[PDB]
Design a protein around this motif. Structure first.
Motif, PDB file in Angstrom:
ATOM      1  N   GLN A  10       1.489 -98.675 -17.316  1.00 17.24           N
ATOM      2  CA  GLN A  10       2.875 -98.266 -17.112  1.00 17.24           C
ATOM      3  C   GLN A  10       3.805 -99.117 -17.973  1.00 17.24           C
ATOM      4  O   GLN A  10       3.646-100.337 -18.019  1.00 17.24           O
ATOM      5  CB  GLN A  10       3.285 -98.449 -15.649  1.00 17.24           C
ATOM      6  CG  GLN A  10       4.640 -97.829 -15.313  1.00 17.24           C
ATOM      7  CD  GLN A  10       5.118 -98.092 -13.904  1.00 17.24           C
ATOM      8  OE1 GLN A  10       4.484 -98.798 -13.122  1.00 17.24           O
ATOM      9  NE2 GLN A  10       6.263 -97.518 -13.568  1.00 17.24           N
ATOM     10  N   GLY A  11       4.816 -98.479 -18.581  1.00 15.31           N
ATOM     11  CA  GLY A  11       5.768 -99.185 -19.425  1.00 15.31           C
ATOM     12  C   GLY A  11       6.949 -98.316 -19.849  1.00 15.31           C
ATOM     13  O   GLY A  11       7.026 -97.155 -19.470  1.00 15.31           O
ATOM     14  N   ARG A  12       7.840 -98.914 -20.652  1.00 14.48           N
ATOM     15  CA  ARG A  12       9.046 -98.277 -21.160  1.00 14.48           C
ATOM     16  C   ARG A  12       8.704 -97.452 -22.396  1.00 14.48           C
ATOM     17  O   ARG A  12       7.818 -97.834 -23.155  1.00 14.48           O
ATOM     18  CB  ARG A  12      10.082 -99.359 -21.492  1.00 14.48           C
ATOM     19  CG  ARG A  12      11.427 -98.847 -21.988  1.00 14.48           C
ATOM     20  CD  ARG A  12      11.613 -98.926 -23.496  1.00 14.48           C
ATOM     21  NE  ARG A  12      12.917 -98.423 -23.917  1.00 14.48           N
ATOM     22  CZ  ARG A  12      14.086 -99.015 -23.669  1.00 14.48           C
ATOM     23  NH1 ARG A  12      14.135-100.230 -23.150  1.00 14.48           N
ATOM     24  NH2 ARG A  12      15.216 -98.392 -23.958  1.00 14.48           N
ATOM     25  N   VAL A  14       9.504 -96.575 -25.898  1.00 18.08           N
ATOM     26  CA  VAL A  14      10.192 -97.120 -27.062  1.00 18.08           C
ATOM     27  C   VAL A  14      10.315 -96.056 -28.160  1.00 18.08           C
ATOM     28  O   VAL A  14      11.299 -96.087 -28.901  1.00 18.08           O
ATOM     29  CB  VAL A  14       9.536 -98.432 -27.557  1.00 18.08           C
ATOM     30  CG1 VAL A  14       8.084 -98.273 -27.993  1.00 18.08           C
ATOM     31  CG2 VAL A  14      10.352 -99.093 -28.663  1.00 18.08           C
ATOM     32  N   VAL A  24       4.578 -95.968 -25.504  1.00 25.04           N
ATOM     33  CA  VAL A  24       4.828 -96.685 -24.260  1.00 25.04           C
ATOM     34  C   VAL A  24       4.528 -98.164 -24.513  1.00 25.04           C
ATOM     35  O   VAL A  24       3.428 -98.487 -24.956  1.00 25.04           O
ATOM     36  CB  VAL A  24       3.965 -96.110 -23.114  1.00 25.04           C
ATOM     37  CG1 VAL A  24       4.143 -96.870 -21.804  1.00 25.04           C
ATOM     38  CG2 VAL A  24       4.230 -94.625 -22.898  1.00 25.04           C
ATOM     39  N   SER A  42       3.870-108.049 -25.528  1.00 26.22           N
ATOM     40  CA  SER A  42       4.212-106.633 -25.466  1.00 26.22           C
ATOM     41  C   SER A  42       3.222-105.787 -26.270  1.00 26.22           C
ATOM     42  O   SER A  42       3.230-105.842 -27.500  1.00 26.22           O
ATOM     43  CB  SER A  42       5.639-106.393 -25.917  1.00 26.22           C
ATOM     44  OG  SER A  42       5.801-106.616 -27.310  1.00 26.22           O
ATOM     45  N   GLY A  57      13.991 -95.177 -22.666  1.00 25.09           N
ATOM     46  CA  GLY A  57      14.249 -95.934 -21.448  1.00 25.09           C
ATOM     47  C   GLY A  57      13.308 -95.600 -20.288  1.00 25.09           C
ATOM     48  O   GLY A  57      13.258 -96.358 -19.320  1.00 25.09           O
ATOM     49  N   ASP A  58      12.568 -94.485 -20.387  1.00 25.39           N
ATOM     50  CA  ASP A  58      11.791 -93.957 -19.277  1.00 25.39           C
ATOM     51  C   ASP A  58      10.588 -94.859 -19.010  1.00 25.39           C
ATOM     52  O   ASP A  58       9.752 -95.028 -19.891  1.00 25.39           O
ATOM     53  CB  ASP A  58      11.331 -92.526 -19.568  1.00 25.39           C
ATOM     54  CG  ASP A  58      12.468 -91.518 -19.633  1.00 25.39           C
ATOM     55  OD1 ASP A  58      13.439 -91.776 -20.375  1.00 25.39           O
ATOM     56  OD2 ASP A  58      12.370 -90.475 -18.952  1.00 25.39           O
ATOM     57  N   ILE A  59      10.508 -95.417 -17.790  1.00 31.55           N
ATOM     58  CA  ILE A  59       9.446 -96.336 -17.401  1.00 31.55           C
ATOM     59  C   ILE A  59       8.282 -95.499 -16.865  1.00 31.55           C
ATOM     60  O   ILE A  59       8.026 -95.473 -15.662  1.00 31.55           O
ATOM     61  CB  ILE A  59       9.953 -97.399 -16.396  1.00 31.55           C
ATOM     62  CG1 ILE A  59      11.280 -98.044 -16.824  1.00 31.55           C
ATOM     63  CG2 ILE A  59       8.889 -98.460 -16.130  1.00 31.55           C
ATOM     64  CD1 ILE A  59      11.268 -98.697 -18.195  1.00 31.55           C
ATOM     65  N   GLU A  81      10.583 -93.273 -13.717  1.00 28.21           N
ATOM     66  CA  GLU A  81      12.011 -93.531 -13.841  1.00 28.21           C
ATOM     67  C   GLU A  81      12.571 -92.693 -14.990  1.00 28.21           C
ATOM     68  O   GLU A  81      11.852 -92.387 -15.942  1.00 28.21           O
ATOM     69  CB  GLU A  81      12.267 -95.024 -14.058  1.00 28.21           C
ATOM     70  CG  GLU A  81      13.730 -95.414 -13.923  1.00 28.21           C
ATOM     71  CD  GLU A  81      13.989 -96.906 -13.793  1.00 28.21           C
ATOM     72  OE1 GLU A  81      14.462 -97.333 -12.720  1.00 28.21           O
ATOM     73  OE2 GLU A  81      13.724 -97.638 -14.768  1.00 28.21           O
ATOM     74  N   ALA A  83      15.809 -93.152 -17.142  1.00 32.23           N
ATOM     75  CA  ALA A  83      16.990 -93.803 -17.691  1.00 32.23           C
ATOM     76  C   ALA A  83      17.744 -92.824 -18.590  1.00 32.23           C
ATOM     77  O   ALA A  83      17.133 -91.935 -19.184  1.00 32.23           O
ATOM     78  CB  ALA A  83      16.591 -95.045 -18.448  1.00 32.23           C
TER      79      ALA A  83
END
Ligand SMILES: [Mg+2]
Ligand SMILES: [Mg+2]
Ligand SMILES: [Mg+2]
Ligand SMILES: [Mg+2]
Ligand SMILES: [Mg+2]
Ligand SMILES: [Mg+2]
Ligand SMILES: [Mg+2]
Ligand SMILES: [Mg+2]
Ligand SMILES: [Mg+2]
Ligand SMILES: [Mg+2]
Ligand SMILES: [Mg+2]
Ligand SMILES: [Mg+2]
Ligand SMILES: [Mg+2]
Lengths: 85, 122, 86
Positions: A10-12, A14, A24, A42, A57-59, A81, A83
């Motif tokens: 799971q991650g943001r 980019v 991600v 990272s 921004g979506d996690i 999420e 964003a």
RNA sequence: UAAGGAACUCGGCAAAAUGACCCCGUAACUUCGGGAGAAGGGGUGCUCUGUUAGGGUGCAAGCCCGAGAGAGCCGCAGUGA
RNA sequence: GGAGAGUUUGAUCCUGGCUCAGGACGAACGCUGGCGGCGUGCCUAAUACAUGCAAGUCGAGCGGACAGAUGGGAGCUUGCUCCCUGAUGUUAGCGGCGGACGGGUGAGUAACACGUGGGUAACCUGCCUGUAAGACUGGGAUAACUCCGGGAAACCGGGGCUAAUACCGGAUGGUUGUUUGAACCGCAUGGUUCAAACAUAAAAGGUGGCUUCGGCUACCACUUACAGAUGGACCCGCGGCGCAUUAGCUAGUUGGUGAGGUAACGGCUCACCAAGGCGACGAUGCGUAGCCGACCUGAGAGGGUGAUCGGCCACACUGGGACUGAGACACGGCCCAGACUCCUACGGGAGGCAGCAGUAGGGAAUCUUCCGCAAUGGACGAAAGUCUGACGGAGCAACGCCG
RNA sequence: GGUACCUAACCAGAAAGCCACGGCUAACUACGUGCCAGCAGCCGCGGUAAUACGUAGGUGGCAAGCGUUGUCCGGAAUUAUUGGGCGUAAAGGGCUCGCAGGCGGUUUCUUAAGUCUGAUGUGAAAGCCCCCGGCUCAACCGGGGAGGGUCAUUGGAAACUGGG
RNA sequence: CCGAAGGUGGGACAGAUGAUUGGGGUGAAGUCGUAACAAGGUAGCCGUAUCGGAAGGUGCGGCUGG
RNA sequence: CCUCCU
């Protein structure tokens, strides 16, 4: 079916411009081997989003799959999420 | 028809790639050399690491020419290039391999080691 | 070679390939017949070609040339084209 | 103009070679402009697809300009002088 | 579970280097040298190699020569000859399996190569051992042997043949594909199970014994499904080198869509689209390097090494390619190119010591051109057995450790 | 391979060594040289009385060897995380403004990435090692453990670090 | 069609070597001066400029480690 | 102004 799951991450998000695809970035805090400080690691990843729903921004959570391109190895399981701006 | 200043390919693995003809041997005002004639020559291009080095003066025997050669039966042989083989004074080649076809005329002049080493003798 | 069974295996395998190439060629030619029939709009011939294709395909499988998955892949491709006509 | 190819000559003098367009590519050095057409390479006719894509003109019809492709065809050689 | 000492000064304390006592080794060199028992022995030139040997086997697939003679025959100097094809034996040649293991070397590789991570829904998986169907019915060719022509030759092309457990035809086959639906669902791509149709796809018999000579067997063994197992393939997180006096790199590059290919997922390949991807968390380049179990050292943190022995990887004179198959894109194969060795009466052939020994060369320096498959393990075979420089032994050398 | 091992004589006969002896580190005197010849890990010895040189006679360790050279770790808290420094010994940038980065007052709530913790799977064999046994002990072989992961998966805890 | 080797070309990088040349290190008893250490006999030193056989000298600014 | 080497 009693299936052993593949490694899930799971991650943001980019990157996104790549259609049917995302980047991600699983940010994490690995300890430095010698000095023991938590260094801000990272790892970027390459997952698949068929609908082109995800954005900056979506996690999101992503799960391992068959190799979906040269670099792509994961799917967009769900946008957790959302964003905006 | 090889004369002073004619450049020849070297048809062997002696180290010389190209030689310049310094002198046709075998008489005072002799202008021209043909297949089976010996020439003095300088090495203009060499393979790096070879036995024969650039700038060496050497003897060579001509083994192919564009002018070619006439035979007693009234037949001729010609080649696409002029080539020679660096030799010692006893006619043995300084290299160990001969490249490309040589002319039968080398048997007549007693260049036997060359004739034996050549892939073809026409 | 410099071994007895090597010299046999040299002589054998040459003679095998020739025979083997025949059956691949035969198959590939039989595959081209089906592919050709799609252009002309003739399903009735394509079916009768697909049988001869399928025979020639499966003969190679028996000998040990075309893998079962390789054959599986071909007969799939052809059958989609036949059904895609109608 | 055979073979050779500056051996000629004070001296490559003279001659030969190079030469168009498009494309690729181009070093030292530099006053940062240059050097540079550096160098070194590739393509080039005709036919069909084809009144191609696209552009100019025009209400249209038409006329004019015109890449780049693919498939062929011929010659020793296609900026065939 | 951790010891210090010497050395800057006329003397001092401090700072600071230097040196020493310890352990280790594939060691080398001196000098010296008795024996024994275990272990170790090209680290240099992945240099070149004379010679020999290192993978061959199955006659219970095989026609065939060439033998066998239990017997009859056998002219008859009992001296020798023989005429039939005894049981069956030797098995060039054909067919099968193995030769892709075992053995060697670490050249390349900074990479999912390795060490710790998944799909198994992206794969494969012969042999082995199970549970589940069968070897039914068509022939036609071809080695050898022979005939002919070659080859001084090495090697080989035609002709007529003959066999096979070699090959191909056709039915019906659960596999496979397609379609028609279901059932049931997962981690999205889906997966698993079932039924019909259409299409396709099977085998091989050789031995010993009994045949009521209709046949029926049995070890071996040919072929088909669901298994298990085994050995491979891909993918991924995370790890583990130096240099910024290497800062930009990339253009099948990054993703898409389609087509093809592959056992298999995939720019893996290509077409057509866009414009991405990577990088100061060090991209790219250069240098160096097989990785790991371990090993040496150290109180430990760490540091160094990765000979011998085990595992993964890679390579096989240099380089390219496919063939055969369950499986090499081959360690003693081939095809092609190159540099080297050999043969060739010159047209053409043959080979690769990084297999064991050995040689030359290089070097400070590293063995026997040894005996045996008795043992252990292989390959082949139903077995006897054959082959095995794997392996067991022995030779050599104070090179270790220790008796 | 008539090789290991036993008996039995000839019989302890065949089987002792090398290196070191200023100090570190337990271990000295003649003579010959005379800054020569030579020595040397370091400090340093020799210029006509050399306990460190040439020779000659003389002694602690480990045990057919030990000297010499080469490589690695230690000693070296001497690259310092454990575990060092920078007024004058080597060392504060000439001084700012600041991007990234690093670090961040107090309370409360919530979150749970970090942190901690339970349980399960693997980390071959050999080697080294915990109990360690066997082979007469050994210079050696077996089993059951342990280590082995900044590792999964899952369930907690929530003070602290991080997020709202 | 792809394609190893080969050929041609212009660049990149690395090593060896090169007439000569530049400082550097080292070397019991060479030559020249005496710059520094004392107020070192013109306090020294730092930056910079310039000059001079050579240490150095002189200017400007700075420091006290005068 | 200088004061050889150990
Ligand atoms: Mg002319
Ligand atoms: Mg001419
Ligand atoms: Mg002239
Ligand atoms: Mg003249
Ligand atoms: Mg002119
Ligand atoms: Mg290497
Ligand atoms: Mg240390
Ligand atoms: Mg000072
Ligand atoms: Mg200071
Ligand atoms: Mg300051
Ligand atoms: Mg003074
Ligand atoms: Mg003064
Ligand atoms: Mg002045």
């Amino acid at each position: 079916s009693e299936r052993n799951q593949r490694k899930v991450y799971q991650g943001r998000v980019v990157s996104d411009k790549m259609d049917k695809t995302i980047t991600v970035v699983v940010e994490t805090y690995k300890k430095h081997t010698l000095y023991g400080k938590r260094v801000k690691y990272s790892k970027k990843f390459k997952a698949h989003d068929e609908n082109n729903q995800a954005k900056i921004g979506d996690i999101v959570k992503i799960m391992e799959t068959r190799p979906l391109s040269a670099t792509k190895r994961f799917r967009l399981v769900e946008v957790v999420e959302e964003a905006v701006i | 028809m090889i004369q002073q200043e004619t450049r020849l390919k070297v048809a062997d693995n002696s180290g010389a790639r190209e030689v310049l003809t310094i002198k046709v041997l075998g008489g005072s005002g002799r202008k021209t050399a043909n297949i089976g004639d010996v020439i003095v020559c300088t090495v203009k291009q060499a393979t790096p690491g070879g036995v024969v080095k650039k700038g060496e003066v050497v003897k060579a025997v001509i083994v192919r020419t564009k002018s070619g050669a006439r035979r007693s039966d009234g037949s001729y042989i010609s080649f696409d290039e002029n080539a020679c083989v660096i030799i010692r004074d006893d006619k043995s080649p300084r290299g160990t391999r001969i490249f490309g076809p040589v002319a039968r005329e080398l048997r007549e002049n007693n260049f036997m080691k060359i004739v034996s080493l050549a892939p073809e003798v026409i | 070679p410099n071994i007895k069974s090597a010299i046999k295996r040299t002589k054998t395998n040459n003679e095998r390939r020739v025979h083997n190439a025949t059956i691949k060629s035969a198959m590939r030619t039989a595959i081209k017949q089906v592919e050709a029939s799609v252009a002309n709009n003739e399903a009735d011939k394509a079916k009768t070609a697909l049988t001869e294709a399928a025979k020639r395909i499966d003969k190679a499988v028996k000998t040990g040339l075309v893998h079962k998955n390789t054959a599986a892949r071909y007969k799939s491709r052809l059958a989609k084209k036949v059904n895609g006509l109608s």
